[PDB]
Amino acid sequence: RKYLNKLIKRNSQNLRSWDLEEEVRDELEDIQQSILKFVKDHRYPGLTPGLAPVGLSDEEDSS
Amino acid sequence: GLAEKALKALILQCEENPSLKNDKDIHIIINTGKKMGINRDNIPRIIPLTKYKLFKPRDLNILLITKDPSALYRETLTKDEHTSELFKEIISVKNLRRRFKGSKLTQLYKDFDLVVADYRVHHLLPEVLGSRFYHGSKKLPYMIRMSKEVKLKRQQMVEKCDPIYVRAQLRSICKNTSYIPNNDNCLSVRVGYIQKHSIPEILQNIQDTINFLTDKSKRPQGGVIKGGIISIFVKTSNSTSLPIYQF
């Protein structure tokens, strides 16, 4: 009884390992669907450091 | 305790010594366990403050350098009543090279306190401005987006200007501070003015800055220190090093 249940659990774990995936699941989902179907300038990389932190209160206030 | 005690000591030494009175800025120098792999350009890299503002555009004169034509830029900026009182002077690069050389150039250097230009002109800027500006980080030319609009390959760009966006940039900049990457363990940043604020504000600013620099996030901008940070020294322009966070 309980031994049979334990064997069931063990072999189920075996099959699950054979067919396992955690996030490759969604990744391969997107890939299979496709198969079956910020700011950045290109010429100055120096801009990504050069830019400033836009700040909502910093526009809103009339100080 | 060491921090604010050394702060009091350096203050009193400033008001006693003649020249230490004359230099007017607090600087902190971080020595890191590892060097930085970022070769020194002059791109002004800025760091945000979560708590306390430092300088105000209302308090500071300012220079803007446009692209070449500059007609619509200048007239729009001076007209939209959000910058007419804000930008002290506006000049194009060619006109600047036509107007200032040598003596008059360093005359400018003495006059203005903070300058900025278009991010499509920043890299050209040095030779027309001079190594004389290009020392330290006091009058290091900044870099502001001017259009809030982007370029695409094989697509002509269109040029605009909006006071809301540009004024946001300026206010953000004077609210927070900046730095410049090096290739060794020693990087320096100005932190606060000697009377605009207080020791608790100093310590808050220091803690926020160190947290930003050590933060794993914002790696393109903030996650730049390599290895375990060694220590932080404090000074003014001519004082001596004072130690903080030795390990």
Add this chain to the structure above:
Amino acid sequence: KVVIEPHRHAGVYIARGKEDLLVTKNMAPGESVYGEKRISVKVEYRVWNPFRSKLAAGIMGGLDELFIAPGKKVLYLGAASGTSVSHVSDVVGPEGVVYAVEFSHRPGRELISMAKKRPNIIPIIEDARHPQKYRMLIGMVDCVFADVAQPDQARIIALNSHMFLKDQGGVVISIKANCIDSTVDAETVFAREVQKLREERIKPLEQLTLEPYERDHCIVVGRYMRSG
């Protein structure tokens, strides 16, 4: 290196190697009938392409009472080009028999060659809707598959099942909505054909939408009780 594993139904196997694939055990080995690939492990094997055989898509789609068994007699309407009928022959094995039916010609000759290679095949080259020209040769099928685009699917099944399907028999049909209606939703068409068979003495047990493999087909499976 390659791992074999059995499926819920007999004869169906999945290979877990560098890949995972659907496969059957060749009685005739090393002779790939339509350029399909193969694998050995020793014994031989032969792969299915679901994209080419509708029933294969159903196998992967999951079906409990798919009455086609190794030790069984199965009738095969819509046997064309011999592929899927060769597969069902191979899954029923030597003791099982597959009564294939066709009415085109060129797939007829191809199926002739396929029979010339396999014994479990038995080809019939006759009218789909005139089941006499094979009543006199077919006897007591226990399980029937049909993939036919003649919109009288319900008729042809009803006729040949009354003449051939032993009681409590198994029936399975492929339906092309774009073939029979092409205007109203495939769900509606599927349901409609369901009560069609329901009246035509099929107890409808299940149906699979063949969604991610073919456009707009349903496989319907039912049983056949107290009928004749």
Add this chain to the structure above:
Amino acid sequence: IKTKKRKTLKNLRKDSVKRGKFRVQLLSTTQDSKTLPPKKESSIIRSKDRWLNRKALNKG
């Protein structure tokens, strides 16, 4: 109130519920199936009768 009573009425009339990826629905009654040809198509009746109730003839 009467709304939720109508809703649970429709529930106790519906013969199709969803069970995860599986979907469940009945097999209708043989007596009804023999004594009555299936009901008509609301879409098509609305089509033709609206057509007779077209607004080009001043049916008003």
Add this chain to the structure above:
Amino acid sequence: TQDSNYVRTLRQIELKKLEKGAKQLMFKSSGNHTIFVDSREKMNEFTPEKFFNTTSEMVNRSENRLTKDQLANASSIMPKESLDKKKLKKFKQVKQHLQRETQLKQVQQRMDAQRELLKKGSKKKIVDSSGKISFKWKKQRKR
């Protein structure tokens, strides 16, 4: 003409080598599964687990459904990290087949447009509204 030949030959290469890669590759079945019940009480009491005589993940997984009695992977080399990555590897590999395929299709199409431009007739150049060139030939039966 020779450039067209070269490109189209590469396109055929990639196309059918794609079709082979797919035919050996496998997808996952996502199709609807509606069950027939003859009584509303059986509807309510339904459980796929008992209707299948299987377990939870066996019920949820689609293409392989083995019952408890049917039941009654370390040989796979580090499957938790290896075989999954190689499966995604094959899927990717097919992906760049197909995208390279479409890119070459476009190249060949535009280049045959240019050939036609060259051949013969009474052409006409129109700038279509989104700003894209096209050519139309006067109604004329070539002798």
Add this chain to the structure above:
RNA sequence: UUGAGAGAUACAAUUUGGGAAGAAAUUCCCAGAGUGUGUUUCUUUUGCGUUUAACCUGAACAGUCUCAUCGUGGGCAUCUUGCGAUUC
């Protein structure tokens, strides 16, 4: 801002079942389902103003001769830096 429908959800609470742990109380795992709230999807209706509307075509690009395609020479790096593409 007519009803009604279908559906997607999200949130919240409610519960269906299999396994396991548990003396048990309980807990775990797993697939769930519905309720309500927020969100949006989509359908029809209801009423209202309103006769056209889009595309195609016939001898329809071309005297400031248009168009194609190889080559040469220059502009735009303060950047359309130019794809077997059509930068000017």
